[PDB]
Write an enzyme that holds these catalytic residues in place. Structure first.
Site, short mmCIF file in Angstrom:
data_model
loop_
_atom_site.label_atom_id
_atom_site.label_comp_id
_atom_site.label_asym_id
_atom_site.label_seq_id
_atom_site.Cartn_x
_atom_site.Cartn_y
_atom_site.Cartn_z
N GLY A 1 0.43 -4.17 3.89
CA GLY A 1 0.33 -5.60 4.07
C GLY A 1 1.67 -6.22 4.43
N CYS B 1 0.80 -1.22 0.00
CA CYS B 1 0.00 0.00 0.00
C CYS B 1 0.84 1.27 0.00
CB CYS B 1 -0.94 0.00 1.21
SG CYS B 1 -1.61 -1.62 1.64
N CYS C 1 -0.44 2.40 6.11
CA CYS C 1 -0.26 1.03 6.55
C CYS C 1 0.00 0.13 5.35
CB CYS C 1 -1.48 0.55 7.33
SG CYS C 1 -3.07 0.98 6.57
N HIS D 1 -8.83 3.96 -2.87
CA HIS D 1 -7.47 3.56 -2.53
C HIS D 1 -6.87 2.81 -3.71
CE1 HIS D 1 -3.94 1.97 -0.81
NE2 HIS D 1 -4.44 0.90 -0.22
#
Ligand SMILES: NC(=O)c1ccc[n+]([C@@H]2O[C@H](COP(=O)([O-])OP(=O)(O)OC[C@H]3O[C@@H](n4cnc5c(N)ncnc54)[C@H](O)[C@@H]3O)[C@@H](O)[C@H]2O)c1
Lengths: 401, 729, 401
Positions: free
Chosen positions: A389, A92, A387, A357
């Site tokens: 993964g 991300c 944040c 997103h």
């Protein structure tokens, strides 16, 4: 460390929704070429030979997004063949990681002017299309307790006492602030409308926004159902053995939206700006990469923010605007609760819950969002983090010039 | 590069060679050093010669038939060798299964049809040999089973079972239906799932039917004869390969689902099977087969497989061979059994005895209750007739052997007595004393008591030599263990006659000397008491349940603490306190007793009341009691989860060694299988006694590391973890 | 230049061949973990929390190599969850690009100790498995004049007058020098043998090597048969209109081998190495990214080498060893002819013609090859460069320490 890295331009496309979206017919390569042409329009005499690289974040570099889409954008747009082109994937934060890598390449003194950003056409290349070493190898999936991001957000809300009304209250807040930003004209200069090969308008706004969202409408949605496959709840509680039951509070209305979009940032040294007649807008103050437990993958923004605050020599009170990606509502409330972030400083122009997103491009989108708002508010500093993964985290501090 | 183990510088020959006039080679397996064909070193050399000969004479061979002269087709591998494989022997184990599979791969790619004539049980490497064939015919004879049960021994189908079953059924079906649990299938169900192609009525038709299939396959399918589906140009794996978009969407959920069904227990065999299956489906067959070999060697040289091979192979054989049966005793057949008590246990006791073919006289107070226990046995037949297993000829004969009655004189001609009346010594004396002189003098007089010592119960009969403890577990029709309890007056002949009865009904016996709590009830008490102690210390109850599940137990301890009545555990405490106080010693209360009495004080005695550690609704267990964390102030004590796990496992392991020191048990095999089948000790440990010699932690591996870890636990949590001197030097 | 980037370790796996290869059964994730565990063996007291990022190049980031395989390596190896992990793709220079980006992140001052390298299991994830933003878009493929590398190589030989015997003479030199380097023990310390979970050996040598190659055997080989698809010769000659006919001199014996492999380099600041007791082996003097014509796709090293020499104030005479990847023989002979590189300095330990070209890992493999050869010769400087798809170029100058 010698050369200071400056942001001269920071633009993005509108974000087209997942189902019957306006950008579904647009190849992600074209999303980047349009932004390149917008930079050429804002600077007609720019010597593009001085551009040494084009760095794009892309989480699913497969199909339309494979074969180094950054290099494809360099060639398809007719940029000089010496202008580089490299794709990177840090989940991300790929969009912000591209900007940070571009800034760090400038600081090393071995690069002068770099284009950085990301692109993710999720309507055409869904998440997980690239496969995955962890997800598809059972031995790694068994050792490293794999769990989707949605389960981590529910676990955060459970441990922190974030009720379904608490997360929906934030989702309502993001829709309102995103609608107020468009109405006030905050995004008029940085959102570049996407057009076809004939100049006809395709999309000029973030069509994922639901500006008439109500508390009643959010309460009627249903929780997420990689999830909806068995195993992930028990796996999370095997590590978090003191938690008895996960409270599933996240829906499609309080989570980030699946959208298509791209973003492009022009980063260079002060000499590159003075030589090309470019006015600097912000200075890359510091970057940081950290992370937390890979089951609660989304608690990574907290150590990454403290890490970048330490390097820049700043505290929370020194930051005027905090911009954290709205992957899930509980992640932002956890981040706000940990660092005591004032509410009028956090995601002031709405986030991914309202606008979407686009994985590989979100980092550069919300970065340019803060470049504009620092100018519009005549404020000094902003901190941008996302944040990740796998339990990672990236943070960046910018300073208006 | 060779079909042989050695290719430098003299075992038995276990395979006959028959080539008929039509060029069909009949490989007949017949190991002369046993009655079961096994993948020992003799088979590897015998099959290595035959496959060499199949290649050298390929211009004169039209088809191959694999058969067996034994009652069984082929059963398992060389466990006596796999249990001795040290980590530095991994290369030897790797080379062994590679040689075995190179033989099967050559037989599979011979360009000629190969048929397996499955005359009996084809288990483990036996089915793997048949899987290498292109066609499998099985005789529907009774006692025959087919499957790959090496996961039950801590291993995996390393002779091509993983690779081939995945090619036939896909990753998901082969794992769930065949590989992960090592399920055994009767020939009809083996044909249903696809492990078997044809069925015949007798073994005589097998070889002629296999040769007839070869002659027919060559005529109709000449280009595809002897070519497996995965060796064809357009092979498409069922369910897809890991690259397939449909499988890739659900593939990341396979390890998480497996982690759910295993509850996090450290059992590495199912993990490696899933790894070898998916990684194998990504590459060609030969590469997949070699990946399968490396995972097989990883299990064989590990400690967990050495635990399971010791428990479920050696210990089980020693028990079934009569290791605890008294020496030099003949068999005394059982003509008519008589069950005193038609309750939950006596109903199943009368069923398992009737299912075995024994006449059973079931007695209860009223004929109403005397047929409520028989009604229990019709619920199992009406469900076994619906599932299409048994027949109405067999079921009508079974229920006819069960004779319900309330006449005490109906125990005429009864030579075996199993009493399941309620826990009252005066009642058991009453029921027995009113039956001893009507049953034969040669009759066994057994008692299903779980707490009351057999020594005191035996003093109600004249022939105390014939009184013995026959302790079943609930439900009787499913639990495999029978705990035979030897009282002070119990004779060796009575012990052996009951030992023969337990095997005759298809159950596993252990011999226990009479003591308080016997063995199963005593050891499992330390497990539930250790968890209640942790709850009182302030440990979160969700963590305690997680510790029990990740330790390998089938039920978490607080949940199990609700099934067993809390006022039943409290009675066992008061019964043991009176026993110690009458002896003169001071009774030191286990720290769990204060938790029991606190819960009983709150009216939460468990599942029967509907309130215990869990809340209950409509008979279904709900969540944990929310008031439990405020009562014991849980969350204030947060020890490492591995300490909670070891505290429960070591409590039972130490109590097992104490039972062995006291002479409660006779062998370690009776302790392991007794703890596994009786109280649910995790199978990966190989039993509560094997857990000592097979413990593995940061301290090391072995009895000494167990002693070091037990003392590490002792200094932290209590002196009950201090090991007995028998484990020291 | 306040913070300098130092190479403390540079290791690689043996390269397993494409067909019947020893490494075909090995997941590419496992190739990286083995190198990570080797670094742990050489530094048992290393505080891995100081490692802030793992940067791996990968040209086909899909399937076994998808889902950010760098992060997958971090989690599967048990490294700290703060240790980052990012995959990048700049075609054939991805391995050297990862080292450059690591060095540039160290010089920026915002990273302390970074693992950098690459992985490419071409026998499991073939070239082109990720698709391509160019080949998938006919309008873009039609515009950029896409011509595969092997045809660009044959076109270089035709323009520069390189004969079939000339390119086969260099291929013989590569096989001989690789065999002499292996027999002399040059590669003993840096080539880490690959082993299975039981410790059994899988591969301990570069099995693609053909040490008994002869000039007569190279002549019996046939030219390469994607370039076999029609039109590419006519498309190339439309751009290079002065060449009437392309002499196809390149075969499988004078071109890079398709292999599986992985490489890993530990890069950090002087303070980071002193903190962890690491002895610096070499210093990154400068990095440069440039490009050449995108139809020839292979003359990128020449402007990139000149750009990194100007950046460091050096000339060809200041360089002791030149390491250019042996993608094709004519590429190296062209590079040697342009810069007048002496024969005794060029690919002194053999190259990809003999040992193979794992796309994502090659740049880090040949960089560590020069780290060892500078120590063994006690020489000062080595220049490392690789040609890139799309006509790009990357060059790095290292200095022995
Ligand atoms: N319940 C368990 O889980 C369990 C486990 C192990 C051992 N046991 C032992 O099993 C026995 C209880 O068996 P159950 O659970 O089937 O019984 P139960 O709980 O169903 O007991 C009720 C039965 O007692 C019978 N009964 C009462 N007085 C009788 C008499 N004079 N003659 C004959 N029957 C009489 C009733 O008619 C009825 O058959 C006890 O010795 C107990 O310790 C029970």
């Amino acid at each position: 460390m010698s050369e200071e890295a400056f942001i001269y331009e920071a633009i993005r496309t509108p974000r087209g929704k997942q189902k019957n979206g306006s950008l579904h017919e647009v190849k992600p390569l074209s999303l980047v070429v349009g932004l390149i042409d917008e930079l050429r329009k804002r600077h007609p005499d720019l010597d593009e030979n001085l551009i040494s690289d084009v760095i794009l974040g892309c989480v699913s570099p497969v199909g339309d997004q494979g074969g180094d889409i950054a290099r494809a954008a360099v060639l398809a747009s007719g940029m000089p063949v010496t202008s580089g082109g490299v794709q990177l994937n840090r989940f991300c934060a790929s969009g912000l990681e591209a900007v940070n890598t571009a800034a760090q390449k400038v600081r090393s003194g071995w690069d002068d002017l770099v284009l950085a950003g990301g692109v993710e056409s999720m309507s055409r290349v869904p998440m997980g299309s690239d496969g995955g070493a962890m997800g598809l190898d059972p031995a790694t999936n068994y050792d490293v307790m794999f769990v989707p991001q949605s389960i981590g957000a529910d676990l955060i809300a459970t441990i922190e006492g974030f009720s379904r009304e608490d997360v929906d209250a934030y989702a309502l807040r993001s829709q309102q602030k995103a609608a107020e930003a468009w109405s006030g004209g905050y995004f008029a200069k940085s959102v570049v409308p996407v057009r076809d090969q004939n100049g006809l308008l395709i999309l000029d706004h973030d069509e994922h926004m639901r500006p008439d969202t109500t508390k009643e409408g959010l309460a009627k949605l249903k929780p997420a159902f990689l999830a909806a496959l068995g195993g992930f709840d028990d796996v999370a509680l095997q590590k978090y053995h003191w938690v008895e039951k996960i409270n599933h509070v996240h829906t499609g209305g309080n989570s980030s939206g699946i959208v298509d979009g791209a973003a492009l940032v022009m980063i260079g040294s002060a000499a590159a700006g003075k030589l090309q007649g470019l006015t600097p807008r912000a200075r890359i103050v510091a970057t940081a990469t950290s992370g937390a437990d890979p089951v609660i993958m989304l608690t990574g923004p907290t150590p990454a923010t403290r890490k970048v605050l330490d390097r820049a020599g700043l505290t929370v009170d020194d930051i005027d605007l905090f911009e954290l990606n709205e992957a899930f509502a509980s992640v932002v409330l956890k981040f706000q609760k940990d660092l005591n972030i004032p509410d009028e400083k956090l995601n002031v122009n709405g986030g991914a819950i309202a606008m979407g997103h686009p994985l590989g491009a979100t980092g550069a989108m919300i970065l340019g969002t803060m470049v504009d708002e620092l100018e519009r508010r005549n404020a000094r500093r902003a901190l941008i983090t996302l944040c990740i993964g796998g339990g990672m985290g990236v943070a960046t501090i910018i300073e208006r010039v | 590069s060779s079909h042989h183990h050695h290719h430098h510088s003299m075992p038995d020959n276990t395979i006959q060679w028959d080539k008929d006039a039509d060029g069909i080679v009949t490989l007949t397996m017949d190991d002369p050093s046993g009655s079961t064909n096994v993948m020992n070193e003799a088979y590897i050399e015998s099959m290595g010669k035959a496959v060499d000969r199949l290649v050298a004479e390929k211009d004169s061979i039209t088809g191959v038939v694999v058969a067996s002269a034994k009652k069984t087709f082929f059963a398992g591998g060389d466990v006596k060798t796999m249990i001795q494989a040290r980590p530095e022997d991994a290369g030897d184990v790797f080379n062994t299964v590679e040689t075995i599979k190179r033989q099967l791969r050559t037989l599979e790619t011979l360009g000629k049809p190969v048929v397996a004539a499955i005359n009996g049980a084809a288990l483990g490497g036996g089915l793997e040999i048949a899987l290498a064939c292109h066609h499998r015919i099985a005789a529907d004879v009774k006692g025959s089973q087919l499957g790959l049960p090496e996961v039950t021994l801590g291993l995996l189908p390393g002779g091509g079972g993983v690779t081939r079953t995945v090619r036939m059924f896909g990753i998901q079906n082969a794992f769930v239906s065949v590989l992960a649990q090592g399920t055994r299938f009767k020939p009809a169900k083996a044909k249903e799932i696809g492990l078997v192609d044809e069925l015949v009525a007798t073994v005589e038709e097998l070889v002629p039917a296999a040769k007839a299939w070869i002659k027919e396959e060559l005529k109709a399918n000449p280009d595809g004869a002897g070519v497996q589906p995965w060796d064809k140009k357009g092979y498409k794996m069922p369910g897809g390969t890991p690259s397939s978009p449909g499988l890739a969407a659900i593939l990341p959920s396979f390890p998480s689902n497996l982690r759910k069904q295993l509850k996090g227990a450290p059992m590495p065999a199912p993990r490696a099977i899933l790894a070898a299956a998916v990684e194998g489906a990504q590459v060609d067959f030969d590469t997949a087969s070699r990946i399968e070999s490396r995972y097989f060697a990883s299990l064989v040289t590990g400690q967990v497989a050495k635990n399971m091979m010791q428990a479920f192979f050696f210990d089980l054989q020693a028990i079934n061979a009569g290791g605890s049966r008294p020496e030099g005793i003949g068999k005394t057949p059982i003509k008519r059994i008589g069950v005193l008590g038609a309750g939950m246990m006596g109903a199943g006791i009368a069923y398992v005895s009737a299912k075995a073919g024994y006449e059973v006289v079931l007695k209860d107070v009223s004929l109403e209750a005397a047929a409520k226990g028989k009604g229990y046995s019709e619920k199992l037949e009406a469900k076994a007739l619906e599932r299409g297993r048994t027949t109405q000829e067999r079921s009508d004969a079974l229920l006819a052997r069960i004779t319900p009655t309330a006449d005490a004189a109906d125990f005429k001609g009864v030579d075996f007595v199993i009493e399941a009346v309620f826990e009252n010594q005066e009642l058991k004396h009453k029921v027995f004393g009113e039956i001893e002189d009507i049953v034969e003098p040669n009759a066994i007089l057994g008692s299903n008591t779980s707490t009351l010592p057999i020594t005191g119960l035996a003093t109600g009969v004249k022939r105390q030599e014939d009184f013995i403890g026959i302790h079943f577990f609930s439900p009787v029709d499913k639990m495999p263990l029978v705990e035979i309890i030897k009282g002070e007056k119990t004779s060796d002949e009575a012990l052996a006659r009951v030992f023969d009865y337990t095997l005759a009904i298809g159950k596993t016996p252990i011999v226990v000397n009479d003591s308080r709590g016997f063995f199963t009830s005593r050891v499992i008490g330390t497990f539930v008491n250790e968890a209640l102690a942790m709850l009182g210390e302030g440990v979160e109850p969700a963590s305690i349940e997680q510790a029990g599940s990740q330790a390998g137990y089938p039920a978490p301890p607080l949940q199990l603490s609700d099934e067993l009545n809390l006022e039943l555990m409290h009675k066992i405490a008061v019964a043991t306190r009176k026993g110690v106080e009458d002896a003169g010693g001071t009774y030191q209360p286990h720290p769990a007793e204060a938790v029991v009495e606190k819960m009983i004080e709150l009216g939460r005695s468990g599942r029967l009341k509907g309130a215990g550690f869990y809340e209950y609704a409509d008979g279904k267990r709900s969540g944990l009691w929310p008031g439990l964390r405020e009562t014991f102030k849980s969350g204030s004590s947060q020890p490492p989860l591995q300490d909670m796990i070891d505290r429960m496992l070591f409590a039972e392991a130490l109590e097992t060694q104490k039972c062995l020191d006291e002479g409660v048990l006779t062998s370690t095999a009776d302790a392991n299988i007794g703890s596994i089948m009786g109280i649910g000790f995790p199978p990966w440990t190989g039993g509560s006694a094997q857990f000592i010699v097979g413990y593995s932690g940061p301290a090391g591996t072995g009895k000494a590391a167990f002693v070091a870890r037990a003392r590490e636990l002792a200094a932290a949590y209590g002196d009950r973890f201090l090991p007995p001197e028998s484990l020291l030097s």
